[model samples]
Target: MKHSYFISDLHLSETQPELTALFVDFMQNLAPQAERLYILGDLFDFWIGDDEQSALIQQVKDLIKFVSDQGVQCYFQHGNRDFLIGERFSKETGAQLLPDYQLITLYDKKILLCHGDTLCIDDEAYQQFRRRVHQKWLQRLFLCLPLKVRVIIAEKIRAKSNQDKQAKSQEIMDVNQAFTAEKVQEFGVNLLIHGHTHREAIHQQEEFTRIVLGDWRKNYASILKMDESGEFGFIKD
Candidate 1:
């Protein structure tokens, strides 16, 4: 049967060799069976820039390329962690980049795809930081720095972000219902899929359905599979 897979927040990194292994297994054995694969964001724990090369990055690129070569259409949206993923990354992986807010018709369902952070409007500080980092000129300036320097800066930012999270409540970190509902209404999509909060579940709202993809853990993998029949559900691995 034809299928489309959606996943995000793998947070693949050098520290997590096992997660990479699981990803390899998925790409080689499972993902190849799908017609399309959508990575909604945060595939990496941190991405300094597309110019920074590493064994882990190469392996991921090769894996995605292998799947793409098998005729699976791969699409990626920038997660907050990996917003710098650019043309070179796409060129290397055979995966196409998608805008942060993307609307698509899948299996006769109108679905909105995003990284999920945008829905957390209640976190004003975070929203402001997101806006600053997303500025085009700022990104270009950051990318112009040496790779090592950029890595250092990213590490510092990650450390500070972690520190900030400790002071915030869980509710603050999650998506705002009002804002999410507004987005759903504005886009006219009954279904929305995203990953960021790492909380996985299907939320049946009054007028729409929201599916939050979970972060990949050492013992578990979170995936959403939509079959040719237009039926969809979570897959445990």
Candidate 2:
């Protein structure tokens, strides 16, 4: 049976050369063999704009392009960290961009995909911040700023985010069960697959199961594999 792979929260960045190396090896060795590769979110630590011609970014783009050239389809979704990744990057990698929330038929089963951060209903502060940053007008304004200015702003934002996280409880950072169930029903899907919480596990409710993907920020890399036969589960690399 044909197989598909899903991964997210890689958080690739220049500071983490070893993680980037591992990802490059995975793309070259494991990902191309699949019929399709779905990157759920946070493919990068942060993407300010497509105009920055950084070597690290170019390397990742070239890798994806090379894999796509090999006839393996690729899909990407914006994560909380890299939502600024734009059209030029997508074109370069030959990866189709997905909306923040989407539904697809996989192996005859309807599935919902998301970044999973939105389901953290308990984190009202983060939710408000998300809404502000995600607004179309604000994004456009940010994008129009000078690249250097954006970089400085981004660094400060990330720094502040880290500081905020330290004060947050583990439960506050996780997806809320009631919110997740509500979204599942809203999307008309019994199976939800997403990443963002960085907690990898399968949570089974009475009517549905939520599959949370792991982040590469940890000691080990992770992925979720699905096949035409309906077999699906997590794999650590």
Candidate 3:
């Protein structure tokens, strides 16, 4: 009960004032109770990093600040929509950025944590696009550009993304079972926790155990927690 991590596709609306309030309330109120929080991905609906000051972003910063003041750490993983999470956000929110793949030892088990989309091996097209966008040179160049340019590019990407999602089947959009299995085996982790598929689940595969962290679209939301005995469990926000 000392440490807990939460994450998922928040799809936060920067333009909506009410949503800013809700987000602020969620983080400020919750951070004090937990030792840690992890945001897996899609924290923004359509975010690239606009220079325009955002109340929503401010609330996010405040959440990080609150937790940091209380000596808690915030971890963030990039989602497809918010790949532009930069140092500014991290610096402001007192969060540490995590790679797409990370390992955590929980419940006496090596646990693998991810944003989940990278495991969507079946989605060849998405994988190709993911590769392109995640290039180091491209990311470096993109971040150095003006914030206006970043915002415009992100919007354009989102427009095309909406169209692509419409064309793809729902199953293909989720993580690839075979790929996931392979990763779990490679990492030698019995517990694999991830967001992006957005359904709370405990999948017992031949090789390992997998859990999908549910998104915040509905329900209070879910967080992955490990007790002193190293037992892992999911709690709703």
> Highest lDDT among the candidates is held by which one?
1
How close to the true structure is residue 63 of candidate 3, measured as C-alpha lDDT? 70
Report residue 145 deviation for candidate 1 (angstroms).
1.0
Q: Give the per-residue lDDT digits (tens) of candidate 3, residues 1-237.
A: 565666677777755445455556666776677767778888877665634466566666677788877887778888887877777778777778888898876445687888899988887899999889878788777768887777778778878888998999989988888788889888887788888876778788777888787765434556566655666667654
Rank by TM-score, descending? 1, 2, 3
- Model 1 agreement with the true structure over 101-218: per-residue lDDT tens digits: 9999888899999999999988899999999999999999999899999998999999999999999999999999988999999999999999999999999888999999999998
List lDDT for all candidates, in order.
Answer: 0.93, 0.89, 0.75
Provide the lowest-lDDT 10-residue window in model 2.
214-223
Best by TM-score: 1
lDDT of model 1 at position 105: 87
lDDT of 2 by residue, 1-237 (tens): 698889999999898887798788889988888898999989998888888778898899999998899998999998999888878888989999999898999889999999988888798889999999988899899999999999999999999999999999999898888888888999899899999998888988889988989888535778899999998997765
Provide C-alpha RMSD values for all models, in order.
0.8, 1.3, 2.5
Candidate 3 colliding pairs: 107-230
Please report how far candidate 1 places residue 3 from its true position, in Å: 0.4
Local error of candidate 3 at residue 56 (angstroms): 1.2
